[PDB]
Design a protein around this ligand. Structure first.
Ligand SMILES: NC(=O)C1=CN([C@@H]2O[C@H](COP(=O)(O)OP(=O)(O)OC[C@H]3O[C@@H](n4cnc5c(N)ncnc54)[C@H](OP(=O)(O)O)[C@@H]3O)[C@@H](O)[C@H]2O)C=CC1
Ligand SMILES: CCc1nc(N)nc(N)c1C#CCc1cc(OC)ccc1OC
Length: 157
């Protein structure tokens, strides 16, 4: 399976200044559970802002950097190398990845952040007429999770 995993806001903001604009541990928990024991594919900037691979799953970084050789990370230099990755593969971002991959994925796991944030990076426009809602679960608003959010699993129609 080839999936997208993204958190985006009402205006499809995904990032600001190489960081996430909001702080939503529920969504981190959702990522962890969904991708633990599987593969995350991310662009180099996303990797460099995380700072280290996420534990208990294969971390794959896409970069044109021929000197890239990070401990605990696998590197690919071409989009086409994604299709050779075995198992359940999640396109983990950021913007360039989502743009290159939106038309190829089976499937998208989207956390809709029900707010409008200052952003400099975006999820591409998509229509609910190409995508069927397999599940829509309202996130629990919280002490520690203070923005309304909805977990979507969408499957290509
Ligand atoms: N809300 C969310 O779910 C997520 C948010 N983000 C956010 O997104 C932002 C980063 O997004 P963005 O700036 O687009 O960057 P990316 O993380 O997508 O990284 C861009 C880099 O990835 C590499 N790359 C992409 N495509 C190719 C290709 N076809 N061949 C070779 N290398 C390639 C290049 O690295 P190189 O220059 O080394 O060649 C490129 O410059 C940050 O703000 C981050 O916080 C990221 C993921 C999820
Ligand atoms: C955890 C944020 C997130 N949620 C969903 N649903 N999908 C995603 N692809 C992401 C992401 C991301 C990149 C990222 C994660 C992070 O937490 C460990 C810290 C920084 C990040 O990039 C700046």
């Amino acid at each position: 399976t080839l999936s997208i995993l993204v958190a985006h806001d009402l205006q499809r903001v995904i990032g600001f200044e190489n960081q996430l604009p909001w702080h939503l541990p529920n969504d981190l928990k959702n990522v962890k559970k969904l991708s633990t024991g599987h593969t995350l594919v991310m662009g180099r900037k996303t990797f460099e802002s995380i700072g280290k691979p996420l534990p208990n799953r294969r971390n794959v970084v896409l970069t044109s950097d021929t000197s890239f050789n990070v401990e605990g990370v696998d590197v690919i230099h071409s989009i086409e190398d994604i299709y050779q990755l075995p198992g359940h593969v999640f396109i983990f971002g950021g913007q360039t990845l989502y743009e290159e991959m939106i038309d190829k994925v089976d499937d998208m796991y989207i956390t809709v952040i029900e707010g409008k944030f200052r952003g400099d990076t975006f999820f591409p426009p998509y229509t609910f007429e190409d995508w069927e809602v397999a599940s829509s679960v309202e996130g629990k608003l919280d002490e520690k999770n203070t923005i309304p959010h909805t977990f979507l699993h969408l499957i290509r129609k």
